[model samples]
Target: VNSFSGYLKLTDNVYIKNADIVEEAKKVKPTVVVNAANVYLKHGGGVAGALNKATNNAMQVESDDYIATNGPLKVGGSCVLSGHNLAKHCLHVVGPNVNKGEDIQLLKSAYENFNQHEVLLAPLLSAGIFGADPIHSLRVCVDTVRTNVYLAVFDKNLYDKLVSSFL
Candidate 1:
C-alpha cells in the first residue's frame, strides 16, 4: 500500500511524505519546524494550518505577535514561535502566495533561514496553497539541511521528486 507514499535517508536527516503528517510529526517530535506562511499568519491554509492545528492555535496567536512586531512581513522575512503542544519552535516564513517564478528568491530566503536545529520539520515552500513547482523549493531545503529535516509534502509531483532525489 502507498499509505505512506514518500521517502527519506539514513545518513542525511531529511524525509518526504504523503501520509498523515500530523501523526508522523507527533511521532518524530521535532524540536523545530519551518514552513511557508504569509505576513498576517493566516495559517489556516495548508501545511501551515495543519501544524498550527496540532499546536492548538498557538501558531495563530504567535502570528498575531509576529504581525505586531513584524507585520506585513516581506517575502524572505520570518518569525519563530515556541512552547507547548508541538515542536519546540516554528519558523513561520513569509513566502510566495503563488508559485510564480519571481518567488524563487523568496523561497531561497526562506531556506536560508534554516539554522541547523536538532530536528527541523519543513515543507516544500510555495508547493501547497502557494502552488509552486516543488522541484525548486525542495532543492533549496535539501541544499541547506544541516540538522534533521522532515519535508511534509503531499503532492505526487513532490513525492516523485523526493523518490528521484533520495534514491
Candidate 2:
C-alpha cells in the first residue's frame, strides 16, 4: 500500500512527509534528492545506500571521483552529483555527529547549505548513524531550509513522532 500520508505543513512551502526518499523521488519526481551522507560521502548505508542502488551504483562512482577531486565533505558541508535513475540530481550533505561534539550550528548548516529547488526531497539528517535524535534533526532541517522541501522518513513510528512535534 502507498503509505503516502500527507505532509506536516511547516509553512507555505516547507513540509515534512512520512515517506521514503527514494520512493518519493520516483512518485513525486522531485528535482533533487538530498542524501544524509557522511563526510567521506560513502554510500554504504542508510539513505545513501538506497539511492546508490536505485541509481545502479553510478552514484558511488561519481562520489568517489568527487572525493578524489574535491576531497572529503566536511560536516555541515554539501556537494551535488548526477542522479542517474532517480531524481535529476543528488545533493549530499554531511551532518554533524552528535556523539562527537553536538554542534547545533553545524547540523543547521547541513540543511541550510543546499541550493533550493522547486522540488527538493530530504531525509531526517543526522538522525541515524550520526547519533542525533530524530526530532532534533527534523527541527534543524525544517528551521533552516526556506524553500520547497519534503523531509521524508521511512519509519511509520518516527513519522508519527515527527508529526507529533508540531502539536
Candidate 3:
C-alpha cells in the first residue's frame, strides 16, 4: 500500500514527512558565520534587542566556532563588536565603505580561519550602509576565499538575480 488513509495499520511504521523542512528546523552550522551587523539588526526588528538576543543565542550554542562581524568603513560601532556576546570565538572585520581592498582582506582572514567541515555564511553585502553592489561583493568574496561560501539574502529579487548571473 503506497498510500494510506485514516489510521492504517502496517507491519512496519514508516514515517514520511518533509525532510527539507525538517532540515530547515535545525540550527545553522557554518565554518564562518558573517553578519552585516547593522543590517541584520535593523531587518530583524528591535535593533538593539535583536542584537542582544542573537548574541546570546550565538554564545550559548556556538561556542568555539568562528563568527565574523563586519560593518561599513566609516560607521564606527555600527553594531556589536565584542566577542563576549558570542559563546564561540569571534573575529571582527571592517571594510572600506567605497573601496574593495578592505573587504578582500576580511575575506582572506576568514578563509585562513575556516575549518574543512564548516560552511561560510553571510548576508547580502548590499544590505549594509556601505551600499556595496551585491553581485560584486559575492564575486569578490568567492574569489578571496579558498573554501566554499554560502550567501543568504532577505531580498528575493537580489537572490534570483545572483542565481541567474551565476548560471
Candidate 4:
C-alpha cells in the first residue's frame, strides 16, 4: 500500500487527498467511514472491496447480514455497520449506476445520506465501474458532504485532477 498523510482543504470541513482509503481511515479513526456501496451491499469491488479486505471480511459479512435482514439497499439510501478494525462504524451508501440513467440526484444523495460523524472518509461515489465521471462525481462529493470529510482518490490521475480543481 502507498503511504500517504496529506490532504488539500476544500471548505472549512471538506478536504481531498490521494491515498489508500483503508489506510487513511485507520489513521483518521472517524466516527464513520463512508463506502461507495452497491444496492446489493456486497463488498465485492472498488472501495467496498478494499474495506472488506481491510476489516477482515467482517464488513462484507455485516453488510450481507444487513441485506438479508433489511433487503437490498436502494440507490441514494444507506445503512451503518460496525467498522470492525477500521473505525467506529462504516456508512455504506449506494450511489446511482449511471449506466441506468442520468440520475446524478441519486449520486448526490449517496454523498448526502451518511449520519453525522466528527470526521468522514469518503470516496467519489459512482466514479468507478458505476460510471459517474470522476470529476463530476468529485464535485458532487465535495459539494454534498457537509462535515469534516477526507475524499479518498486512489488513482494518481484522478487525484491530480481533483487537486487541480482546487488550484
Report the CA-based lDDT of candidate 4 relative to the real structure.
0.80
Overlapping backbone residue pairs in candidate 1 total: 0
Q: How well is each residue in 3-38 modelled by candidate 2, as lDDT tens digits? A: 334877777656777777888888765668888888
**Candidate that scores best on TM-score:** 4
Cα-based TM-score, every candidate = 0.78, 0.88, 0.46, 0.89
Ranked by TM-score from best down, the candidates are: 4, 2, 1, 3
Q: Taking the tens digit of each residue's C-alpha lDDT, what string does model 1 give over 1-167?
A: 12223455524655676644566566655666675677778878688788778878877887777678765767777777773465566777766766443455677776667654556667777676787757766677677656666677666665866667653
Comparing 1 and 4 on lDDT, the stronger one: 4
lDDT of 3: 0.36
Q: Top lDDT: which candidate number?
A: 4
Check candidate 1 and list the clashing pairs.
none
Q: RMSD, model 4, all Cα superposed?
A: 3.4
Residue 130, candidate 3: Cα error in Å is 1.7
TM-score (C-alpha, index-matched) for candidate 1: 0.78
Q: What's the true lDDT of residue 115 in model 1?
A: 58
Q: 68-153 in candidate 4: lDDT tens per residue?
A: 89999888988888888888888888888887774877877777784356577788888887788888887786677777777888
Clashing residue pairs for model 4: none
> What is the descending lDDT order?
4, 2, 1, 3
lDDT of 3 by residue, 65-155 (tens): 3222332323212222333332132322233334433443343333333333244434433334545676666565554545443444545
The worst-scoring run of ten residues by lDDT in candidate 3 lies at 14-23
